[PDB]
C-alpha cells in the first residue's frame, strides 16, 4: 500500500536539516544546469529588454536522501520542494521575473535511488541587454543572460552543464515569437566573477539577434527617395509657371518634415547618430538645396535670363548624379558590414 512509501518518506525527512548544504565538511557540491527555451518573447528597444520563457532544470547529488525501496524512482509533489535543500540561482541581470503559479506551483521534484535530485521550474525572465544602435537599422546585436549562485562562494558551489555545452541551451523550433528581430544562434560560456565578498561561478548564455529590414524599406527610405525624385522633377517644368513650382517646393519640404518627425518617433533617445538619421538628413538637405536653387533662379530671371536657363539645365544634369552616387556609397557602406 501507500503506508510503506509514507514510512520511507518520514524516515527520510527525519533529521534532514535544510539550512545546511549537502557535503559540508567534505567535497564541494556540484550543480548541473540545463535550459530549454519554450518561446523567445518580444524584444523591446525602448526599455532595451527582452522577455524569455524557460524550463530551468537543475540536478545535484545528495547523500542523505538515499533509500532502499521497490520504486527506485520517486516523482514527488511540488510542495515537498521547500523542505529539502535547494540551491539559489538568481539571474545576474534580470530586471523583473515571475515564476508561474497557474494551478499549482510549477515545480517538479524527482529523487533517484542513488540520491541524484532533479528539480525544475518554469520561468518568465525579463532581462536587459545593452545595445549599440549606431548601425541601426542594419544592426546585429547579442543579448546575454548570466546566472550564478548567491550567498555561496566558488569554494562551496560550482555550476556545470548537464550535456555537451553546445547542446545545453535548447530552443524550440516554433517557439520563437519575434515580431521584428530574427534569431540566429545561441552560445554558452563559463566564467568566474570576483567581488568584495568573494569569487562566484557564473554561467553566461548569449542569444544572437538580427533585425529584419523589410519594414523600414517601405517605411521611411522609399518615401524619402520618392520625395527626392519628385522635387528634382520640378526642374524640368518651365520657369514661367511660378505658382506650380512654388507649391511643388513647399509640399516637398512639408512632406520631408512629417517624415523626419516619424523617423524621430521611430527610436528611443540616444546620444549616437543613427544611420537612418544620416540618410534622412542628406535627403532633406538635397530637397532644400533644390528649393534654394529654384528660389535663386526666380530671383535671377529678371537680371539675366540666359544665365538662368544655363543654371537650370546644369542643375537638371547635375543633381541626380550626386544623389545616386551618395545613395550607392551609403548602401554599400552599411550593407558590407
Amino acid at each position, epitope marked *: 500500500n501507500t503506508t510503506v512509501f509514507t514510512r520511507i518518506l518520514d524516515r527520510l525527512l527525519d533529521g534532514y536539516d535544510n539550512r545546511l548544504r549537502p557535503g559540508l565538511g567534505e567535497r564541494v557540491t556540484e550543480v548541473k544546469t540545463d535550459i530549454f527555451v519554450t518561446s523567445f518573447g518580444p524584444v523591446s528597444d525602448h526599455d532595451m529588454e527582452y522577455t524569455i520563457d524557460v524550463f530551468f532544470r537543475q540536478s545535484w*547529488k545528495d547523500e542523505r536522501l538515499k533509500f532502499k525501496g521497490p520504486m527506485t524512482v520517486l516523482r514527488l509533489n511540488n510542495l515537498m520542494a521547500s523542505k529539502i535543500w535547494t540551491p539559489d540561482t538568481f539571474f545576474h541581470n534580470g530586471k523583473k521575473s515571475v515564476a508561474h503559479n497557474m494551478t499549482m506551483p510549477n515545480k517538479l521534484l524527482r529523487i533517484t535511488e*542513488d540520491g*541524484t535530485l532533479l528539480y525544475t521550474m518554469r520561468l518568465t525572465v525579463r532581462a536587459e541587454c545593452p545595445m549599440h544602435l549606431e548601425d541601426f537599422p542594419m544592426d546585429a546585436h547579442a543579448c546575454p543572460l548570466k546566472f550564478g549562485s548567491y550567498a555561496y562562494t566558488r569554494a562551496e558551489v*560550482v555550476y*556545470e552543464w548537464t550535456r*555537451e*555545452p*553546445a547542446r545545453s541551451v535548447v530552443v524550440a523550433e516554433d517557439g520563437s515569437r519575434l515580431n521584428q528581430y530574427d534569431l540566429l544562434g545561441q*552560445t*554558452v*560560456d*563559463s*566564467g568566474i566573477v570576483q567581488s568584495s565578498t568573494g569569487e562566484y561561478v557564473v554561467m553566461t548564455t548569449h542569444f544572437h539577434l538580427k533585425r529584419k529590414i523589410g519594414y523600414f524599406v517601405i517605411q521611411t527610405y522609399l518615401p524619402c527617395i520618392m520625395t527626392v525624385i519628385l522635387s528634382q522633377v520640378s526642374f524640368w517644368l518651365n520657369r514661367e509657371s511660378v505658382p506650380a513650382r512654388t507649391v511643388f517646393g513647399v509640399t516637398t519640404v512639408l512632406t520631408m518634415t512629417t517624415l523626419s518627425i516619424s523617423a524621430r518617433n521611430s527610436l528611443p533617445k540616444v546620444a549616437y547618430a543613427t544611420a537612418m538619421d544620416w540618410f534622412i538628413a542628406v535627403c532633406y538637405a538635397f530637397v532644400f538645396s533644390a528649393l534654394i536653387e529654384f528660389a535663386t533662379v526666380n530671383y535671377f530671371t529678371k537680371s539675366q535670363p540666359a544665365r538662368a536657363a544655363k543654371i537650370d539645365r546644369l542643375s537638371r544634369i547635375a543633381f541626380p548624379l550626386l544623389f545616386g552616387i551618395f545613395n550607392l556609397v551609403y548602401w554599400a557602406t552599411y550593407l558590407n558590414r
Partner: antibody
Amino acid sequence: QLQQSGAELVKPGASVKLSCTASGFNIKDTYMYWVKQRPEQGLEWIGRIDPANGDTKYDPKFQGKATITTDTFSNTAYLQLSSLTSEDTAVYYCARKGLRWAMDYWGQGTSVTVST
Amino acid sequence: NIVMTQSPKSMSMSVGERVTLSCKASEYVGTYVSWYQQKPEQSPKLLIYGASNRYTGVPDRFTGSGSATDFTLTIGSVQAEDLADYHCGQSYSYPTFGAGTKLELK
C-alpha cells in the same frame, strides 16, 4: 584509479572486447570517453557513454565499428569493436570527465595489434 | 565538425628559455580548451583545464591565456624533463584534438 586489460593481438576480421574498470568512485555520476592513438600521430575521439541513461555518442567515421556498454554493478565499461582490418592497430584509452569538461584521468592504455 | 590547428609543429629550445605554443580553433569555442601533456610510453596527463586554470599538482611555471578563438600555453624556466608532447583539445562540442606538438632539447 583506473584499470585496463593487457595487450591484445587478434586476426583481421574478428571482433574484440576491451574493458575499463574504475576504482574509487561510481561512474553513474560522470561520463566515460574512449580515445585512440596511432603511433606518433594525433589523438582521436571514438565515443562517449553516459551510465545514467545508457545513451552513447560516436564519431560518425567510427560509427558502426564500435559499441560501448557499461555495467554499474561491476562498475566497468566495455568497448566491443567490429570486424577490424590491419589498419586500426593502435593504443586505446578510457577517460573520465573533469571539472571543466577536460579528460583528466586516463588509463594506462592497451595496444590492439592485428596480424594474420 | 570543429577542427583545431596547433602551432608550431615542433620546436627545440634550451633550458631556461621562454616557450610559447599557440592553438587556433576554426569555429567558436568559449574557454573550454584544455592542454594535456604526454611523455613517451605513458598515458597523457592534464595540465590546464579551462583557460588560465592550473590542475592540482602542476608547477607554477605553466600558464595559459584564452580567448574566443586563440589560445596560448606559456612556459618560463623550462626544466630538463618538461620536454614531452603537448595537445590542445576543445570540448565545447563533441571533443576533438589538435595534431600535437613535440618538444625536444637542443
